[PDB]
């Protein structure tokens, strides 16, 4: 207990460092997902440009 | 005190829970970078199908 505030604070720093790494990945992956979505839509809208040009 | 460890632990435990959540977000986003990349390529493959059908 007595040193657990410290062990848990350091654990929290590490757990936060890891939730942060996971969260930073979430943000980076969020940026990539969005980039892929913009590119997907680039290609989906393009899919329609060709589909429409095709019909 | 037990309360200092409990609070630091709540920070650590919640940070671990947040790591789970952050990891869930980042692993889901990675799965969705795959779904977006896959769907991007779904659309890219289809762009060629329409582009080719178009040409």
Numbering used by the authors:
A (entry chain Q), B (entry chain P): 11 to 65
What does the report in the manuscript say about this coordinate set?
The thin filament consists of actin, tropomyosin (Tm), and troponin (Tn) in 7:1:1 stoichiometry, and Tn is composed of three subunits: troponin C (TnC), the Ca2+-binding regulatory subunit; troponin I (TnI), the inhibitory subunit; and troponin T (TnT), the Tm-binding subunit. Tm is a long α-helical coiled-coil protein that binds over seven actin subunits on one of the two long-pitch helical strand of actin filament and forms head-to-tail connections with adjacent Tm molecules to produce a continuous helical strand along actin filament. Here we have determined the structure of the entire thin filament from human cardiac muscle in the absence and presence of Ca2+ by fully utilizing the recent technical advances in cryoEM and image analysis.
We also carried out cryoEM structural analysis of the thin filament in the Ca2+ bound state, obtained a 3D reconstruction at 4.8 Å resolution, built an atomic model and compared it with that of the Ca2+ free state. The overall structures of the entire Tn complexes in a pair are similar to those of the Ca2+ free state, showing the same conformational difference between the pair in the TnTN linker region connecting the Tn core and the long N-terminal α-helix of TnTN, except that the density of the C-terminal region of TnI above the Tn core is missing in the Ca2+ bound state. The Tn core in the Ca2+ bound state shows a marked change in the orientation by its counter clockwise rotation of about 30° in the horizontal plain with a slight swing up of its distal tip of the IT arm, the major part of Tn core formed by an N-terminal region of TnI (residues 41–136) and a C-terminal region of TnT (residues 199–272). Most of all, the Tn core shows a large change in its position and orientation together with the azimuthal shift of Tm relative to actin filament, forming more intimate interactions with actin subunits. This is likely due to TnTN binding to Tm in this region and its N-terminal side also binding to actin filament, restraining the Tm shift.
